[PDB]
Amino acid sequence: GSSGSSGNTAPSLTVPECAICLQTCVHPVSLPCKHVFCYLCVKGASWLGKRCALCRQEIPEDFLDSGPSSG
Ligand SMILES: [Zn+2]
Ligand SMILES: [Zn+2]
């Protein structure tokens, strides 16, 4: 069925910047706090632990870990 939908609806076709490493966001992830960061910088950065860097909005484990191992 329908499984796997990410923020596609975009006014342009480019990659935004990051507010954690200060460089092109390799993986722009729309956080529940209305922000964008590298899927890696959010999953676990050097100075980050399951929490935004701009607003520090607690991120739910489900955010990254969604759905059972096997579908
Ligand atoms: Zn980053
Ligand atoms: Zn935030």
Side-chain angles (χ1 to χ4, degrees), residues 1-7:
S2 194
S3 180
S5 170
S6 71

PDB file of all heavy atoms in Angstrom, residues 1-7:
ATOM      1  N   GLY A   1       0.806  -1.207   0.000  1.00  0.00           N
ATOM      2  CA  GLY A   1       0.000   0.000   0.000  1.00  0.00           C
ATOM      3  C   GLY A   1       0.843   1.261   0.000  1.00  0.00           C
ATOM      4  O   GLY A   1       1.884   1.320  -0.654  1.00  0.00           O
ATOM      5  N   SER A   2       0.391   2.272   0.735  1.00  0.00           N
ATOM      6  CA  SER A   2       1.108   3.539   0.814  1.00  0.00           C
ATOM      7  C   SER A   2       1.959   3.604   2.078  1.00  0.00           C
ATOM      8  O   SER A   2       1.436   3.720   3.186  1.00  0.00           O
ATOM      9  CB  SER A   2       0.121   4.709   0.788  1.00  0.00           C
ATOM     10  OG  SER A   2       0.789   5.933   0.532  1.00  0.00           O
ATOM     11  N   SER A   3       3.274   3.528   1.902  1.00  0.00           N
ATOM     12  CA  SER A   3       4.199   3.575   3.028  1.00  0.00           C
ATOM     13  C   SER A   3       5.494   4.283   2.639  1.00  0.00           C
ATOM     14  O   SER A   3       6.239   3.810   1.782  1.00  0.00           O
ATOM     15  CB  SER A   3       4.507   2.160   3.522  1.00  0.00           C
ATOM     16  OG  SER A   3       5.406   2.186   4.617  1.00  0.00           O
ATOM     17  N   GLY A   4       5.754   5.420   3.277  1.00  0.00           N
ATOM     18  CA  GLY A   4       6.958   6.175   2.984  1.00  0.00           C
ATOM     19  C   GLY A   4       6.666   7.476   2.262  1.00  0.00           C
ATOM     20  O   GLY A   4       6.689   7.530   1.032  1.00  0.00           O
ATOM     21  N   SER A   5       6.388   8.527   3.028  1.00  0.00           N
ATOM     22  CA  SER A   5       6.084   9.832   2.453  1.00  0.00           C
ATOM     23  C   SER A   5       6.804  10.941   3.215  1.00  0.00           C
ATOM     24  O   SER A   5       6.564  11.150   4.403  1.00  0.00           O
ATOM     25  CB  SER A   5       4.574  10.081   2.472  1.00  0.00           C
ATOM     26  OG  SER A   5       4.275  11.424   2.133  1.00  0.00           O
ATOM     27  N   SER A   6       7.686  11.651   2.519  1.00  0.00           N
ATOM     28  CA  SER A   6       8.445  12.737   3.128  1.00  0.00           C
ATOM     29  C   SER A   6       8.065  14.078   2.510  1.00  0.00           C
ATOM     30  O   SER A   6       7.404  14.132   1.474  1.00  0.00           O
ATOM     31  CB  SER A   6       9.947  12.493   2.963  1.00  0.00           C
ATOM     32  OG  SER A   6      10.345  12.659   1.613  1.00  0.00           O
ATOM     33  N   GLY A   7       8.488  15.161   3.155  1.00  0.00           N
ATOM     34  CA  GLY A   7       8.183  16.489   2.656  1.00  0.00           C
ATOM     35  C   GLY A   7       8.665  16.699   1.235  1.00  0.00           C
ATOM     36  O   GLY A   7       9.832  17.015   1.008  1.00  0.00           O
TER      37      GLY A   7
END
